[PDB]
Design a protein around this ligand. Structure first.
Ligand code: EST
Ligand code: EST
Lengths: 11, 231, 222, 8
């Protein structure tokens, strides 16, 4: 998954 | 969400605004093409982190699937940086206020190949804002509209939120004394500028791709993926 | 200019260009599409001269706006023609291409998808012919920040609202629908930008013969 | 240039 996908979850 | 009143929407979006960040501008040296691109991309990268947190505070955005959140931000991020830049630059005729310590004129834009054309469009848009006397409350509505609209046809829930932001723009204008006819005329003037911001984003994306492809500047992993989304 | 709302609408309907016909490899499809675009461009200029207020601009301004907007204008026309044909693009009555025929040309299917998505959106909104001709005139006058123009633009906004009021929409519904229609122009700008890059790449490959008019309209974008 | 004349 894209880095953004992960960043959006922090939160 | 859809339940918010006009005033509640405005307050939510005003509260969500990101800070104005500083650049790493080093006044000990002249610019090169490389060092100017480095400053702008370094700035963009730090702004992106705030943009992600801002997006999550736009009514209705976190209700979307993570995939749709990713898609909207990938589509809109440079439009969103640019409308913010143009807003910051309104009270500085002929200059772009990238940061409080990085206020550039079109002649400084010539330092980067192909950049002055994009500066000229951004400056023109800032002048348009100024002559319209764009208000802060209108600005935050427009920036949220870009987020929700730009990638939306590449869902009924999104359009309900967009309709609420329209209601809110009209509310603001009526509250500011505009006649009923002036309200629809100004609504259209503001939304037509979004077509110009899209255009600038597409040209800036092509520009950034060129800079990458010429090894002018090392882009962050985030910027590489945001740029890649535009294929 | 001093036109009534209904007069503006009549004027724009009367000014409409004709629907043209067409006469498959990457080369032939691009040949037909570009051949069609070239012939349509000649008619576009005549149409533009009939958009109320346009010929009041300087020649330089007229050239500039048309050079800026032509592919947006071809595209909104296409999307309008295609509206009653889900999944297909009606380039001409005898050239109705479904989504997959776009794979014949490299880079083309993504553009087909955006046009098809726009056509769907028009259909979902039940876009009307009278609304369509207002939007196409707005594209011409707006697309090229590169006072009389702003007053003509305000007049067309008045005309869209008139149409919606006449249709029975509440004030809230009028403003919402006006915004929905104008937000579609941002998508049409995006497609034109992408389509322009695509056309440029086909020129550079020098696969397809492009007309001199088409080369000049393309050149204006660099 | 074509456009210039056509419009004329
Ligand atoms: C994307 C570019 C670098 C980042 C720039 C930026 C960086 C930060 C910001 O807030 C706004 C903008 C708008 C213009 C952008 C530039 C346009 C072309 C260039 O490649
Ligand atoms: C410009 C292209 C060829 C001509 C196409 C056309 C041709 C005729 C027309 O009425 C509409 C369009 C829209 C999309 C255009 C295409 C998008 C990219 C392609 O190169």
């Amino acid at each position: 998954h894209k880095x953004l996908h992960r960043x959006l979850q922090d939160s | 969400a859809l339940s918010l009143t006009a005033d509640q929407m405005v307050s939510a979006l005003l509260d969500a605004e990101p800070p104005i960040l500083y650049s790493e501008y080093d006044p000990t040296r002249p610019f090169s093409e490389a060092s100017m691109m480095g400053l702008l991309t370094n700035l963009a990268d730090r702004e992106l982190v705030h943009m992600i947190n801002w997006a999550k505070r736009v009514p209705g955005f976190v209700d979307l699937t993570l995939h749709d959140q990713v898609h909207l931000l990938e589509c809109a991020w440079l439009e969103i940086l640019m409308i913010g830049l143009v807003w910051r630059s309104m009270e500085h005729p002929g200059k772009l206020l990238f940061a409080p310590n990085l206020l550039l004129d079109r002649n400084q834009g010539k330092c980067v190949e192909g950049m002055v054309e994009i500066f000229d469009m951004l400056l023109a848009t800032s002048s348009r804002f100024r002559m319209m006397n764009l208000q802060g409350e209108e600005f935050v509505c427009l920036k949220s509209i870009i987020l929700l609209n730009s990638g939306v046809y590449t869902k009924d829930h999104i359009h309900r939120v967009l309709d609420k932001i329209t209601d809110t723009l009209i509310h603001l204008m009526a509250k500011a004394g505009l006649t009923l006819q002036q309200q629809h005329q100004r609504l259209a003037q503001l939304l037509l500028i979004l077509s110009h911001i899209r255009h600038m984003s597409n040209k800036g994306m092509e520009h950034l791709y060129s800079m990458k492809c010429k090894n002018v500047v090392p882009l962050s992993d985030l910027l590489l993926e945001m740029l890649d989304a535009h294929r």
